[PDB]
Amino acid sequence: DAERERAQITLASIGDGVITADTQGGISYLNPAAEQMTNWTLDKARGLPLASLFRIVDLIEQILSGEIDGGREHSKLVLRHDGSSVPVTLVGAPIHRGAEITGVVLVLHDMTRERQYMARLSWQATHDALTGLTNRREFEYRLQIALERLERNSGRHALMFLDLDQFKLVNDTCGHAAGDELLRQVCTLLQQGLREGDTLARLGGDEFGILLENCPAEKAVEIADHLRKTIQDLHFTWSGQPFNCTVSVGLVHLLPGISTLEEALRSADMACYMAKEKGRNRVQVFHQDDVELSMRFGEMTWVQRIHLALEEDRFSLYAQPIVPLGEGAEEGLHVELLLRLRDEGGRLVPPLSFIPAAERYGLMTLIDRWVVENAFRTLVERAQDPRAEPIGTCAINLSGATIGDESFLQFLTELFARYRIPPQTICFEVTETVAVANLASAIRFINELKDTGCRFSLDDFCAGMSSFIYLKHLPVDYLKIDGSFVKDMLEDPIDRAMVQVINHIGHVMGKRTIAEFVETVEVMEALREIGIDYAQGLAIGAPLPFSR
Amino acid sequence: DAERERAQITLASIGDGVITADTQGGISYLNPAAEQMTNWTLDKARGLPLASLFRIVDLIEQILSGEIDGGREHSKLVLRHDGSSVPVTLVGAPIHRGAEITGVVLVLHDMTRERQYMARLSWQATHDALTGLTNRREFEYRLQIALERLERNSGRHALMFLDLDQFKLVNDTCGHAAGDELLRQVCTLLQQGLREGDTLARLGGDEFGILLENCPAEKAVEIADHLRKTIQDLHFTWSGQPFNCTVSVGLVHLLPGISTLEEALRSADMACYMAKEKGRNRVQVFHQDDVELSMRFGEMTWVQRIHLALEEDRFSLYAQPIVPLGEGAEEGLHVELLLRLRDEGGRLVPPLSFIPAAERYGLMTLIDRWVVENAFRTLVERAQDPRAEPIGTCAINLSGATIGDESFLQFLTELFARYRIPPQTICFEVTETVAVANLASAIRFINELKDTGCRFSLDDFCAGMSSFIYLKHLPVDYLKIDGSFVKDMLEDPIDRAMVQVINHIGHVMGKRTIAEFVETVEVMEALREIGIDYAQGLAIGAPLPFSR
Numbered sequence A, B: 001d002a003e004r005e006r007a008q009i010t011l012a013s014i015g016d017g018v019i020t021a022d023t024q025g026g027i028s029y030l031n032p033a034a035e036q037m038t039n040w041t042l043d044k045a046r047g048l049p050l051a052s053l054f055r056i057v058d059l060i061e062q063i064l065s066g067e068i069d070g071g072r073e074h075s076k077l078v079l080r081h082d083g084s085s086v087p088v089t090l091v092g093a094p095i096h097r098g099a100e101i102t103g104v105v106l107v108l109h110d111m112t113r114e115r116q117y118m119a120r121l122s123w124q125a126t127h128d129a130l131t132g133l134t135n136r137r138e139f140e141y142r143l144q145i146a147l148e149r150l151e152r153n154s155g156r157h158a159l160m161f162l163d164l165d166q167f168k169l170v171n172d173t174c175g176h177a178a179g180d181e182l183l184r185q186v187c188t189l190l191q192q193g194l195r196e197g198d199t200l201a202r203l204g205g206d207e208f209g210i211l212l213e214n215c216p217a218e219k220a221v222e223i224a225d226h227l228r229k230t231i232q233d234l235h236f237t238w239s240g241q242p243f244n245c246t247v248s249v250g251l252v253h254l255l256p257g258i259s260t261l262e263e264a265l266r267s268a269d270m271a272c273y274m275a276k277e278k279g280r281n282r283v284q285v286f287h288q289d290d291v292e293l294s295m296r297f298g299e300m301t302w303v304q305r306i307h308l309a310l311e312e313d314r315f316s317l318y319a320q321p322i323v324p325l326g327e328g329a330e331e332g333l334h335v336e337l338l339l340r341l342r343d344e345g346g347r348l349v350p351p352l353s354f355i356p357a358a359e360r361y362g363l364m365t366l367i368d369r370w371v372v373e374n375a376f377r378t379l380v381e382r383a384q385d386p387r388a389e390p391i392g393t394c395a396i397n398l399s400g401a402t403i404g405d406e407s408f409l410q411f412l413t414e415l416f417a418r419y420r421i422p423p424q425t426i427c428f429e430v431t432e433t434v435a436v437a438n439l440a441s442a443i444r445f446i447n448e449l450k451d452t453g454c455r456f457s458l459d460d461f462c463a464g465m466s467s468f469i470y471l472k473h474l475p476v477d478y479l480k481i482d483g484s485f486v487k488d489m490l491e492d493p494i495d496r497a498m499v500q501v502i503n504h505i506g507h508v509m510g511k512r513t514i515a516e517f518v519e520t521v522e523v524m525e526a527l528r529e530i531g532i533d534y535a536q537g538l539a540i541g542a543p544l545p546f547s548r
Ligand SMILES: Nc1nc2c(ncn2[C@@H]2O[C@@H]3COP(=O)(O)O[C@H]4[C@@H](O)[C@H](n5cnc6c(=O)[nH]c(N)nc65)O[C@@H]4COP(=O)(O)O[C@H]3[C@H]2O)c(=O)[nH]1
Pocket: A172, A320, A337, A338, A339, A350, A351, A355, A367, A368, A371, A397, A398, A399, A459, A516, A517, A518, A519, A536, A537, A538, A539, A543
């Protein structure tokens, strides 16, 4: 029928190569994109076998009907038979007649064409890949325009920082794929509650940004409380299991002309942190003098609380083993160090409660200098026993405060002299986020320490081009695959490939990989099969006391 | 007919949303990917108008048949009418019956899905986007494996660095799109001449890398000379105009176990530079003592040549104006400074001949200290005339040598005191490549200088995610759109969009843009329309003498 013309136009409109072949070989259809890719017109290629023209290699034109893919892209090369290869990502599917497998269809994507997609490159640079909302790049730009513009600048604006109180919980509990959905659902929820001419963004992690251009002070708080209540009223469930979904809002009434971008962002960040300190699931409006004193007070509260904890010897160190998945691998003992604080009452405080508050008020350099010294102090005390299990590696986490700290190296040279621990045994751990936050400083730090004999590790690493662009400049020795991927790796196929990608690129960049959150032997065997170097988790070993 | 089942399966296999509608509105077809995207089954959406269901916005379902796109993707949003937007890149095409425009077809791509493509992310990180060959990441990794491996390491390997002698010429003359084709053609040409188990890469720019694992010394040179002759025998033509296409090969006979990656790459780079110094279109085999003395000799030759040129006052400075495209924009005079050397004979030497040789032997810090001092010296001499055209901006190019040079700031503080030129007037210029080469150092440099009052500019900038990732960390004030894009912008549609992308993202990152190589008023008007801030080129003003 002439309905073929409609179908032919549709397939011609599509950018990807479309090859339709018979169950044995012979070509049925070729869209112009496939005709171009294969160097063969359908006029002169119809009925001729696929393999006896060009070649799809790394024979293959049978596993589609048998057992392979079913949606997952696979890297292949179209050997033209004259003008060499065309790099493609294949998608195969069997052509049926109910049960009768009559042929096979292939969806080929030219990896060379990627470079040409401009409207897509322009989008990604102005939007978050996951949510589809504007990113910090575009958001700060939009905020700056709102603060300097001459036209449409009659009223006052409103800036909100909305932190999803349960994002880490969902993500760590259910896996990366779950927390991505929670963010994907919270996005549309805020999107529903926002008028036209309003900027909604994801400024990273669990944080979202709202810009309310030309909005009165009352309306601005009324809108905030509503979005806060609607996230609270949102019932989030992952594989039937429900989550107590809620958000911490920080509001800033902005003024165009007199207020600045740095002040605007720093003010919304103070007020947001305040809603969290004031118990989470709260809106907090910024005020320059009053309810700003709360930060001045909080500084003194935490200076005293952290210092008291150091003099009262309330901090203790725990050790969690990291083991090689390598076949018959010996090596020394490898452990990561985990900090534990015991409150005045005598209860173990998890790092959730004090580390962010000690990060905010700038007391982390202290905690790091305390941790490193006690890790060396404990290593000497352990060394006293001849029969004791020798430690080949000892991973210690460093804050952005320490990376910025110019006096740290001297302190470490002083620690190495005093305790005589070999540098090689030590492996400092910095998170990909912390490194990118102060990029120049992380590089300069990493190199100064690597030259001392120490080792480096890039904790909580998530694959993407940016991360692999950053990884080029960070001379780390190891890569800690973010546990959220390792959690539901055997459940969601995207996270299994996300682990698979970190491993290959990690190895290509000459880095040994570590999988975090390896809770089950089944997970461990999955990672061993993939070729992950080390496993850390509950199936390996739980944190046990290191210090006294 | 039942051929609909074949077509339905094909459209279901495709990842992108496919909406087929009537000339007025009503829906004809929806693939499951479009059904998912639009929140409507074809069972319950057939015949109902497109606009009276969901909405494609920033009405639109008519310009496809009229006049718009014809292949170019356009950013749009599918407003679900219940669960807000889905970010997409649209491709429209009219459905015909010869002349009878019966309907319309739309190809929608979910920008959220981009994040999920893993096989594609893994590829891009191990391959060059343009050529499709392995990148430096993968190539160095493959080389390292070849130097340490226990299995398949009986023989000796061969490393080649093949520099395309005319790549800059084609690119500058014809435009970016031409030099990309030349590289695309040279790729398949080397690909044709390479056996199975051989690594062919593009280690950037005009440079390609060849790894010949387990190959005898004779065969290795025989293969080199052949690939050299076949590139020479390649007839390259752009829009009918032919180019004298040829390559400079540098060969290194590698040994697995005793030889190292750093040595391997540095040796192939020395021998390659040598084929260029020995007149280009040559293969050059590396030898540790003999024909290595040529580098020791070349150091002395250029130490003498550059120093002689400084004491003989043979170097002179030229000024090229950069003008704003801004409507009724005044400002001071903006100029870029260009270095000119006059050889012993009295002939103007173009920077092509001495800058790479003075970069290699490390004499650039010298030339930069000479340039900056004479730019300030000339500015004072110009200032002596009251009626003289005042200079508001003066752009000066800095080498990676100067960026690495810790004593430069002191030198500049010394120059500012001595000549009394205000820092604000000065705009130092560093190329995106030079910055990324020593990333930590460029950031630390840029910031130290920006704090002095100076300005910064990122010369020869090419849009891509990596460049926009780097641009985040480089606090430059301006962006010099690579002239190769500006050259054939009104000819190839990809380069017009490549200019368009740099401008928008550049402005989003709060940077003023400059277009290089603005040869015609027509080009200038094109860039003005796009919203480019400044234009530099022959239509604006040619380089005239600045110094004496
Ligand atoms: N669900 C699950 N969890 C597992 C499993 N195995 C280990 N874990 C948990 O994973 C965390 C490992 O630490 P991290 O991700 O590097 O993340 C660290 C690090 O970000 C920070 N931290 C801890 N100590 C220090 C320190 O001394 N200095 C600095 N700067 N940060 C520290 O706090 C976090 C440690 O908190 P912990 O409560 O010790 O949390 C530990 C541990 O309780 C598992 O199989 N399943």
